[PDB]
Amino acid sequence: VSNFLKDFLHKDRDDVNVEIVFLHNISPNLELEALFKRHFTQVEFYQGSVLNPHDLARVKIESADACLILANKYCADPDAEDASNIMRVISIKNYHPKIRIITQMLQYHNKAHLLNIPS
Amino acid sequence: TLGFFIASDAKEVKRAFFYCKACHNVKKYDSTGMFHWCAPKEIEKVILTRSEAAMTVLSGHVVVCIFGDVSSALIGLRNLVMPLRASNFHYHELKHIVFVGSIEYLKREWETLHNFPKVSILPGTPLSRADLRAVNINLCDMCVILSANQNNIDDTSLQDKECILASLNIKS
Amino acid sequence: AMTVLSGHVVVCIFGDVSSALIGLRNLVMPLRASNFHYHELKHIVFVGSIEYLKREWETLHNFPKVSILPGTPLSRADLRAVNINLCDMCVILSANQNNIDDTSLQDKECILASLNIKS
Amino acid sequence: ELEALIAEENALRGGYSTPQTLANRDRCRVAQLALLDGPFADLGDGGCYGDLFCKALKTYNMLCFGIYRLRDAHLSTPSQCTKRYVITNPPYEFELVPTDLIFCLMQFDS
């Protein structure tokens, strides 16, 4: 989140009226809470799961410009993380097939699974 | 004599109780003879390589794609094979069964399956297209996708990832 | 099955390769005292896992009449092979004395084996 | 009895064929039948389900208890979808289409 907000909300960026909504089931710790407070005017956080359609409806995923899925780069099994990310993509495309998705993939042989989704 | 009925409502069921005409050398079966039985065979006889499975022609069969590890809970696949090996089916009507999955888990569960006539093993991965093409997945009568890794996960909704990925891979 | 055992002792052990040692010498030494004649000694058959008995065999290999059945106390075939209906005593021991979330569930194997033998 | 035998031996034990076991072999099995080319093909072209049930029960002692029907069978336009859904115990006046499957309990014959 620190790196993505550092690049995305850079001062030299041209004036863009875009708000960032972080949807995550795990509640933030103190440092994450402080980081969100430093950008309270442009960044909002909500507790929930992508796999639950109600939580997708809460964050207005049907009107969002794009969905960005970040990967856990430090995990015991990269294949499990890749499968979880692919299933999140499947859920998001099931809710709204016309949304634009940018995802992070750990292993190269797993991204072929993304070709199996019709949407 | 008790009888079992399928009905929309229980009120019409009572009409069946108040109805009167006036108003209106070799062992081929088990000891009980209810299932097909064969002599026990070692697991080495049923394991097929990819090329060997390619040579044999399988059509109208059953493909069981198993997600299992050497340290996972046992599904108990005998309960899946016993209904398919009952004696009310003739021998020629029996459907060949091919278990595609890890060889360690199938070694663990083979000691309850080695008495059934037509069972074969493909030691591969259900997520690999080469194994599914070797077993002629386009000619099978049914593909059963099972996940032995029923262990608890922090998110329960993520327990079905392997099955959904395999289903989409087979459909695509 | 070929050998005939009558008036013997059957020790049904619930043990694993990584479980605490019971110390079965303390069970065999009273039954091998010199005040008993050789013909009055009761044959002892340890029915249980072979790994645990391999671990504890190095303190038992000096006694005259001891035999091993590498099976399970919960299997009726093993109990019928050892002639459980003719034994003088059946001793059910659980080496798996590890801590459990509920202590009352530490006796499940012994109770199940006892009911299985009685039935 | 099979439950007790499996409990005792923890395996399935074979045995030689006897007339009692061969008599025990006779049961009923679950099957699906197609109306495209069977003896019920003429009745499957717009006929009623009750006539099919009565004929199957009277002739072959076959118990039909459900229809398995293409999803786009009711649509006028042709479709390439081969998915089928389940209709449990249709009434007597329920109509039939040639592209249907019938659940049935079929007897054993040698």
XYZ file of C-alpha atoms in Angstrom:
520
model
C 0.000 0.000 0.000
C 2.842 2.401 0.815
C 4.541 1.873 -2.554
C 1.286 1.971 -4.531
C 0.106 5.168 -2.826
C 3.561 6.721 -3.225
C 3.508 6.195 -6.983
C -0.227 6.723 -7.552
C -0.719 9.867 -5.427
C 2.557 11.503 -6.459
C 2.609 15.296 -6.322
C 3.848 15.714 -9.906
C 0.925 13.628 -11.196
C -1.496 15.616 -13.333
C -4.770 16.511 -11.625
C -6.904 13.352 -11.525
C -10.145 13.048 -9.547
C -9.822 9.407 -8.485
C -10.539 7.913 -5.055
C -9.011 4.634 -3.858
C -11.095 2.121 -1.891
C -9.176 -0.663 -0.134
C -11.409 -3.671 0.550
C -9.884 -6.143 2.992
C -11.210 -8.445 5.703
C -8.216 -8.087 8.039
C -8.473 -4.923 10.114
C -5.488 -2.566 9.726
C -2.869 -2.221 12.438
C -1.738 1.084 13.961
C 0.766 1.944 11.222
C -1.722 1.215 8.431
C -4.333 3.289 10.268
C -1.891 6.203 10.482
C -1.046 5.827 6.785
C -4.743 5.944 5.881
C -5.155 9.007 8.117
C -2.396 10.823 6.212
C -4.458 10.308 3.025
C -7.957 10.482 4.509
C -9.158 12.911 1.819
C -8.526 10.491 -1.079
C -8.282 6.961 0.389
C -10.996 4.948 2.136
C -10.794 1.503 3.731
C -13.605 -1.019 4.158
C -13.651 -4.396 5.895
C -14.969 -7.285 3.840
C -14.198 -9.985 1.319
C -14.198 -9.879 -2.474
C -15.663 -13.399 -2.556
C -18.818 -12.103 -0.827
C -21.108 -10.376 -3.373
C -22.648 -8.175 -0.665
C -19.244 -6.660 0.128
C -18.732 -6.089 -3.602
C -22.057 -4.238 -3.628
C -20.978 -2.123 -0.643
C -17.892 -0.733 -2.410
C -19.936 -0.076 -5.581
C -17.870 -2.421 -7.743
C -20.425 -2.016 -10.554
C -19.444 1.662 -10.901
C -15.701 1.339 -10.241
C -13.284 2.218 -13.024
C -10.898 -0.646 -12.251
C -10.066 -3.353 -9.730
C -6.445 -3.891 -8.681
C -5.460 -7.161 -6.997
C -2.205 -7.237 -5.031
C -0.359 -10.474 -4.293
C 1.388 -11.691 -1.144
C 4.992 -11.801 -2.345
C 6.129 -13.563 0.867
C 4.150 -16.799 1.164
C 5.024 -20.433 1.791
C 3.113 -21.657 -1.289
C 3.004 -19.298 -4.302
C 0.557 -21.626 -6.075
C -2.061 -21.199 -3.338
C -1.754 -17.404 -3.521
C -2.057 -17.527 -7.313
C -5.167 -19.714 -7.066
C -6.694 -17.344 -4.506
C -6.032 -14.355 -6.770
C -7.511 -16.191 -9.767
C -10.616 -17.027 -7.732
C -10.921 -13.368 -6.706
C -10.755 -12.456 -10.405
C -13.448 -15.064 -11.097
C -15.706 -13.610 -8.395
C -15.245 -10.026 -9.601
C -15.926 -10.951 -13.228
C -18.958 -12.961 -12.105
C -20.410 -9.902 -10.372
C -19.646 -7.523 -13.257
C -18.179 -8.965 -16.485
C -17.321 -5.561 -18.017
C -14.978 -4.326 -15.269
C -11.262 -3.834 -15.925
C -8.968 -5.920 -13.717
C -5.233 -5.551 -13.121
C -3.858 -8.427 -11.056
C -0.488 -9.466 -9.656
C 0.665 -13.025 -10.377
C 3.552 -14.704 -8.571
C 4.333 -17.698 -10.800
C 4.393 -17.542 -14.587
C 2.723 -20.905 -15.264
C -0.419 -19.869 -13.349
C -1.472 -16.879 -15.474
C -2.629 -19.289 -18.195
C -5.550 -20.026 -15.862
C -6.707 -16.462 -16.545
C -7.372 -17.539 -20.137
C -9.988 -20.015 -18.877
C -12.298 -17.210 -17.684
C -14.673 -16.253 -20.535
C -15.048 -12.679 -19.260
C -46.908 -53.265 4.175
C -45.329 -49.822 4.398
C -45.008 -47.938 1.127
C -42.929 -44.940 0.115
C -44.620 -42.241 -1.958
C -43.510 -39.047 -3.680
C -46.184 -36.391 -3.293
C -46.623 -32.632 -3.228
C -48.625 -32.584 0.022
C -49.175 -35.068 2.838
C -52.982 -34.868 2.628
C -53.159 -36.870 -0.610
C -50.914 -39.555 0.912
C -53.703 -40.592 3.303
C -55.848 -41.646 0.323
C -53.662 -44.746 -0.031
C -54.754 -45.860 3.454
C -58.508 -45.151 3.118
C -58.958 -46.529 -0.410
C -61.722 -49.023 -1.175
C -62.909 -50.262 -4.555
C -66.576 -49.767 -3.617
C -66.349 -45.969 -3.423
C -64.087 -45.642 -6.477
C -14.944 -72.719 -10.277
C -13.796 -69.085 -10.188
C -14.851 -66.330 -7.783
C -16.669 -63.547 -9.636
C -18.698 -62.109 -6.734
C -18.273 -61.542 -3.013
C -19.611 -63.830 -0.278
C -23.033 -62.157 -0.318
C -23.101 -62.118 -4.128
C -24.163 -58.464 -4.344
C -21.010 -56.915 -5.850
C -18.530 -57.874 -8.543
C -15.330 -59.233 -7.024
C -11.903 -60.119 -8.395
C -8.671 -61.567 -7.067
C -6.474 -59.019 -5.245
C -3.814 -57.386 -7.404
C -0.785 -55.252 -6.634
C -0.875 -51.519 -7.301
C 1.957 -51.867 -9.842
C -0.356 -53.698 -12.261
C -2.894 -50.862 -12.508
C -0.566 -47.838 -12.680
C -0.429 -46.520 -16.249
C 2.122 -44.169 -17.745
C 1.006 -41.299 -19.964
C 2.142 -43.089 -23.129
C 0.633 -46.394 -21.968
C -2.666 -44.668 -21.188
C -2.459 -43.111 -24.657
C -2.058 -46.537 -26.292
C -5.176 -47.946 -24.638
C -8.526 -46.577 -25.812
C -10.969 -45.472 -23.111
C -14.536 -44.555 -24.062
C -17.661 -44.381 -21.936
C -15.604 -44.464 -18.732
C -15.388 -42.514 -15.468
C -12.481 -40.188 -14.660
C -11.965 -39.304 -10.991
C -9.665 -36.290 -10.635
C -8.368 -36.229 -7.054
C -6.607 -33.383 -5.244
C -4.780 -35.258 -2.501
C -1.476 -35.242 -0.646
C 0.505 -37.833 1.304
C -0.628 -36.231 4.593
C -4.294 -35.463 3.888
C -7.511 -36.925 5.260
C -8.864 -39.989 3.481
C -11.950 -39.539 1.310
C -12.845 -43.227 1.304
C -13.206 -43.863 -2.426
C -14.543 -47.388 -1.841
C -17.895 -45.698 -1.175
C -17.578 -44.327 -4.721
C -16.565 -47.605 -6.375
C -18.963 -49.997 -4.613
C -22.162 -48.503 -6.164
C -20.531 -48.713 -9.611
C -19.633 -52.407 -9.139
C -22.987 -53.837 -8.028
C -24.148 -57.195 -9.369
C -27.296 -55.852 -11.050
C -24.948 -54.567 -13.775
C -23.557 -57.053 -16.257
C -19.793 -57.317 -16.636
C -19.822 -55.681 -20.073
C -21.906 -52.766 -18.740
C -19.365 -51.896 -16.037
C -17.758 -48.493 -16.541
C -13.974 -48.328 -16.410
C -12.707 -46.084 -13.607
C -9.484 -44.074 -13.899
C -8.183 -42.270 -10.811
C -6.065 -39.313 -11.952
C -4.070 -37.851 -9.095
C -1.127 -38.134 -6.746
C 0.293 -41.628 -6.366
C 1.009 -41.387 -2.616
C -2.631 -40.839 -1.626
C -3.775 -43.609 -3.961
C -1.174 -45.913 -2.401
C -2.676 -45.054 0.990
C -6.210 -45.887 -0.161
C -5.449 -48.786 -2.531
C -5.766 -51.451 0.174
C -9.568 -51.017 0.147
C -9.892 -50.917 -3.667
C -7.768 -53.821 -4.947
C -10.727 -56.248 -5.126
C -12.659 -54.486 -7.914
C -12.353 -55.597 -11.558
C -11.684 -52.514 -13.712
C -9.770 -49.750 -11.908
C -6.708 -47.913 -13.241
C -4.400 -45.209 -11.894
C -2.859 -42.161 -13.587
C -0.170 -40.651 -11.292
C -0.408 -37.062 -12.461
C -2.250 -33.823 -11.731
C -5.880 -32.919 -12.546
C -4.669 -29.404 -13.442
C -2.454 -30.700 -16.280
C -4.004 -30.854 -19.742
C -1.622 -33.591 -20.918
C -2.910 -36.079 -18.335
C -6.528 -35.251 -19.185
C -5.820 -35.702 -22.898
C -4.057 -39.018 -22.251
C -7.128 -40.388 -20.440
C -9.497 -39.248 -23.250
C -11.506 -36.784 -21.174
C -13.654 -35.929 -24.215
C -15.034 -39.495 -24.342
C -15.690 -40.136 -20.641
C -19.214 -40.629 -19.340
C -18.447 -38.589 -16.218
C -15.613 -36.584 -14.666
C -15.736 -36.402 -10.864
C -13.561 -33.693 -9.309
C -12.808 -34.361 -5.633
C -10.609 -32.420 -3.202
C -9.148 -34.510 -0.385
C -7.485 -31.377 1.063
C -10.475 -30.567 3.263
C -8.231 -28.978 5.904
C -9.322 -25.767 7.596
C -8.355 -22.525 5.849
C -8.447 -18.968 7.205
C -11.145 -18.227 4.608
C -13.533 -21.107 3.951
C -14.557 -19.685 0.563
C -10.997 -20.386 -0.636
C -11.339 -24.125 0.036
C -12.883 -24.661 -3.428
C -10.162 -23.014 -5.535
C -8.656 -26.233 -6.915
C -12.026 -27.699 -7.927
C -13.182 -24.509 -9.664
C -9.857 -24.087 -11.475
C -9.967 -27.717 -12.626
C -13.576 -27.360 -13.798
C -12.813 -24.237 -15.833
C -9.655 -25.844 -17.234
C -11.628 -28.892 -18.388
C -14.397 -26.729 -19.863
C -11.902 -24.539 -21.742
C -3.390 -68.803 14.104
C -1.319 -71.985 13.715
C 0.025 -71.819 17.266
C -2.447 -72.480 20.083
C -2.494 -69.971 22.946
C -4.522 -70.727 26.073
C -4.240 -69.308 29.569
C -2.069 -66.430 28.343
C -1.945 -62.637 28.664
C -2.817 -60.305 25.780
C -1.539 -56.725 26.033
C -3.347 -54.468 23.557
C -1.271 -51.303 23.130
C -2.293 -48.009 21.521
C 1.077 -46.538 20.596
C 2.747 -44.556 17.832
C 6.331 -44.115 16.654
C 6.465 -40.677 18.335
C 4.665 -41.328 21.631
C 5.879 -41.432 25.220
C 7.196 -44.766 26.458
C 5.028 -46.720 28.892
C 7.884 -48.875 30.159
C 6.400 -52.346 29.712
C 9.325 -53.987 31.530
C 7.542 -52.956 34.739
C 4.640 -55.080 33.461
C 6.716 -58.113 32.461
C 9.085 -58.300 35.450
C 6.349 -59.185 38.019
C 5.093 -61.920 35.669
C 8.589 -63.446 35.319
C 9.617 -63.768 38.976
C 11.447 -66.878 40.158
C 8.780 -67.945 42.663
C 6.819 -69.167 39.622
C 7.892 -72.396 37.977
C 8.736 -72.347 34.282
C 5.597 -74.283 33.335
C 3.421 -71.860 35.337
C 4.656 -68.811 33.410
C 1.929 -67.139 31.366
C 2.684 -66.430 27.720
C 2.553 -62.718 26.889
C 1.444 -61.415 23.486
C 1.834 -57.701 22.748
C -0.743 -56.731 20.111
C -0.041 -53.305 18.680
C 2.052 -51.136 16.407
C 5.446 -52.563 15.504
C 7.330 -49.238 15.655
C 6.607 -48.604 19.345
C 7.421 -52.208 20.239
C 10.689 -51.879 18.309
C 11.461 -48.810 20.423
C 10.784 -50.662 23.682
C 12.104 -54.117 22.726
C 15.641 -53.398 23.945
C 14.447 -53.684 27.571
C 12.315 -56.813 27.000
C 14.517 -59.187 24.974
C 15.788 -61.064 28.062
C 12.464 -62.648 29.091
C 11.563 -66.220 28.074
C 8.043 -66.205 26.589
C 7.111 -62.941 24.850
C 5.569 -62.613 21.380
C 4.531 -59.701 19.166
C 1.470 -59.214 16.947
C 1.993 -56.133 14.709
C -1.635 -55.153 14.283
C -4.340 -53.005 15.859
C -6.294 -53.673 19.084
C -9.405 -52.313 17.325
C -9.319 -55.069 14.670
C -11.322 -58.213 15.385
C -9.148 -60.369 13.111
C -6.033 -59.785 15.228
C -7.946 -60.514 18.439
C -9.340 -63.727 16.945
C -5.878 -64.783 15.755
C -4.476 -64.458 19.293
C -7.390 -66.464 20.808
C -8.792 -63.665 22.958
C -11.543 -65.987 24.237
C -8.959 -68.241 25.934
C -6.656 -65.634 27.494
C -6.343 -65.306 31.256
C -6.247 -61.508 31.012
C -6.485 -58.746 28.410
C -4.694 -55.529 29.388
C -5.658 -52.465 27.349
C -3.041 -49.703 27.538
C -2.906 -46.333 25.775
C 0.601 -44.973 25.238
C -0.878 -41.831 23.619
C -1.061 -39.971 26.928
C -0.520 -36.621 25.192
C -2.539 -33.604 26.285
C -5.914 -33.127 24.588
C -8.173 -30.060 24.599
C -10.721 -32.152 26.522
C -9.200 -34.599 28.997
C -12.349 -36.750 29.050
C -11.616 -37.643 25.408
C -8.252 -39.198 26.304
C -9.938 -42.554 27.056
C -11.797 -43.017 23.756
C -9.519 -45.727 22.338
C -9.565 -47.819 25.523
C -13.356 -47.648 25.885
C -13.917 -48.460 22.207
C -11.535 -51.424 22.448
C -13.225 -52.676 25.626
C -16.695 -52.528 24.074
C -15.403 -54.144 20.875
C -13.912 -57.039 22.852
C -17.068 -57.431 24.953
C -19.299 -57.437 21.857
C -25.084 -58.902 6.867
C -22.568 -57.338 4.478
C -22.085 -54.569 7.050
C -21.237 -57.156 9.713
C -18.883 -59.042 7.383
C -17.045 -55.836 6.449
C -16.835 -54.880 10.130
C -15.375 -58.293 10.972
C -12.813 -58.580 8.169
C -12.242 -54.909 7.154
C -12.299 -56.090 3.525
C -14.519 -57.675 0.879
C -14.343 -61.476 0.757
C -15.089 -63.384 -2.427
C -17.175 -66.509 -2.732
C -18.326 -69.164 -5.152
C -21.565 -68.694 -7.060
C -24.669 -70.346 -5.593
C -28.320 -70.124 -6.692
C -29.115 -68.085 -3.566
C -26.515 -65.443 -4.454
C -27.633 -65.393 -8.096
C -31.211 -64.852 -6.912
C -29.900 -62.051 -4.682
C -28.295 -60.535 -7.797
C -31.715 -59.568 -9.206
C -32.428 -55.947 -8.242
C -33.387 -52.663 -9.904
C -30.949 -50.056 -11.194
C -31.134 -46.335 -11.924
C -30.932 -45.440 -15.608
C -31.771 -42.743 -18.143
C -33.552 -43.538 -21.401
C -33.823 -41.491 -24.590
C -37.052 -41.205 -26.579
C -35.252 -40.644 -29.897
C -35.125 -44.228 -31.197
C -36.611 -46.440 -28.478
C -39.962 -48.207 -28.477
C -41.475 -45.050 -26.936
C -40.330 -42.815 -29.812
C -43.827 -42.390 -31.262
C -45.236 -41.557 -27.825
C -42.423 -39.063 -27.200
C -43.508 -36.774 -30.058
C -45.854 -34.470 -28.175
C -47.443 -37.236 -26.108
C -48.394 -37.130 -22.447
C -46.131 -38.318 -19.642
C -48.827 -40.449 -18.008
C -49.210 -42.679 -21.057
C -45.438 -43.209 -21.105
C -45.444 -44.079 -17.397
C -48.334 -46.530 -17.765
C -46.837 -48.230 -20.830
C -43.389 -48.535 -19.234
C -44.806 -49.928 -15.987
C -47.157 -52.386 -17.705
C -44.766 -53.666 -20.383
C -41.201 -53.656 -19.019
C -42.007 -53.137 -15.299
C -40.112 -49.844 -15.527
C -40.773 -47.032 -13.041
C -40.347 -43.588 -14.587
C -39.994 -40.894 -11.931
C -38.581 -37.815 -13.666
C -37.705 -35.917 -16.840
C -34.281 -34.502 -17.718
C -34.875 -31.796 -20.301
C -32.723 -29.450 -22.380
C -32.609 -25.912 -21.006
C -33.525 -24.276 -24.335
C -36.178 -26.822 -25.343
C -39.056 -24.374 -24.818
C -37.458 -21.665 -26.977
C -38.582 -21.429 -30.593
C -35.138 -20.441 -31.867
C -32.525 -23.217 -32.142
C -29.681 -23.256 -29.636
C -26.363 -25.044 -29.182
C -26.639 -25.405 -25.396
C -26.634 -29.044 -24.274
C -27.335 -28.325 -20.600
C -30.368 -30.078 -19.130
C -32.386 -29.538 -15.956
C -34.447 -31.848 -13.765
C -38.238 -32.107 -13.462
C -39.294 -34.373 -10.589
C -42.540 -36.374 -10.976
C -44.364 -34.466 -13.736
C -48.176 -34.710 -13.795
C -50.190 -36.953 -16.115
C -50.926 -34.176 -18.626
C -47.292 -33.034 -18.885
C -46.201 -32.994 -22.521
C -43.102 -34.623 -23.991
C -40.529 -33.563 -26.581
C -38.246 -35.937 -28.546
C -35.141 -34.340 -26.977
C -35.795 -35.561 -23.443
C -34.327 -38.123 -21.070
C -36.408 -40.212 -18.674
C -35.203 -41.305 -15.255
C -36.177 -44.910 -14.642
C -35.661 -47.910 -12.380
C -34.939 -50.856 -14.670
C -35.150 -54.515 -13.687
C -32.368 -57.073 -14.083
C -32.619 -59.583 -16.936
C -30.224 -62.328 -18.009
